[PDB]
Design a protein around this ligand. Structure first.
Ligand SMILES: NS(=O)(=O)c1ccc(C(=O)NCCc2c[nH]cn2)cc1
Ligand SMILES: [Cu+2]
Ligand SMILES: [Cu+2]
Ligand SMILES: [Zn+2]
Length: 258
């Protein structure tokens, strides 16, 4: 295992291990709001999260994931720019080493403190792995975290990080409503893109919410207490885990409702 966000395993080298890193539909991107297109085909997002079943929270050595039961249509994403039904499988975050950076997507070059990704897969394909390899296979909802007021829903997530300090550790994490980390308005930008970590597959319909959720500066310190390493290995603090904006190339960013 030789990718990460460090000195010798960073994003700048990922193309040597995953050549699609230099492909035509890479994520994240900068969203130039003056260039955003209005498409009357776009629908409001339908995030049907009422019966979501969270299972566990896991340190995977690059971020932490809250895992959801996706054996059935329990928490799904429909409409927006999508055709068909996409099940929620997990959420996770990216953040930076200080509050002025950390988001993967940027807005007119502005960076937020962190970014939440709610990951969904197209039930057309039977399983998450099959879906991750198709152009219409995945949908990720991105939500910016803007430094400001402390976020009590987020605090419930942060209260668990002491149990999962090192890579491979996990903890029971039941009855977490992923809807509690959404903003009040669901206006969005959308473009076709990729996973932002290896294997960087070009299977993601991106849905970036325009409105951020809040996070305190104190809360941001807590993300940075996690470890990239496994227990027993030299400590590597998870200070930053964001990929920088990649070239837009041919692509169009569309906005809803404009
Ligand atoms: N940051 S993000 O673009 O939202 C994102 C979302 C999901 C994944 C992911 O699932 N990674 C493992 C893929 C895999 C290995 N084996 C089967 N699937 C990576 C990045
Ligand atoms: Cu490498
Ligand atoms: Cu790593
Ligand atoms: Zn992500």
């Amino acid at each position: 295992h030789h990718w990460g966000y460090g000195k010798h395993n960073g994003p700048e080298h990922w193309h040597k291990d995953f050549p699609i890193a230099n492909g035509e539909r890479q994520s994240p991107v900068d969203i130039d709001t003056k260039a955003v297109v209005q498409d009357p085909a776009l629908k409001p997002l339908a995030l049907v999260y009422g019966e979501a079943t969270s299972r566990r929270m896991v340190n995977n050595g690059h971020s932490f994931n809250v895992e959801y039961d996706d054996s059935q249509d329990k928490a799904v994403l429909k409409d927006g720019p999508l055709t068909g039904t996409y099940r929620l499988v997990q959420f996770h975050f990216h953040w930076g080493s200080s509050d002025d950076q950390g988001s993967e997507h940027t807005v007119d070059r502005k960076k937020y403190a962190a970014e939440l990704h709610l990951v969904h897969w197209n039930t057309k394909y039977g399983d998450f792995g099959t879906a991750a390899q198709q152009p219409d296979g995945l949908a990720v909802v991105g939500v910016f975290l803007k430094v400001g007021d402390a976020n009590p829903a987020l605090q419930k997530v942060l209260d668990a990080l002491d149990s999962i300090k090192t890579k491979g550790k996990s903890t029971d994490f039941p009855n977490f409503d992923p809807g509690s980390l959404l903003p009040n308005v669901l206006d969005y930008w959308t473009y076709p893109g990729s996973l932002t970590t290896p294997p960087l597959l070009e299977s993601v319909t991106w849905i970036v919410l325009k409105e951020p959720i809040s996070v305190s500066s104190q809360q941001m310190l807590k993300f940075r207490t996690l470890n990239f390493n496994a227990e027993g290995e030299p400590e590597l603090l998870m200070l930053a885990n964001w990929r920088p904006a990649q070239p837009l190339k041919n692509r169009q960013v569309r906005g809803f409702p404009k």
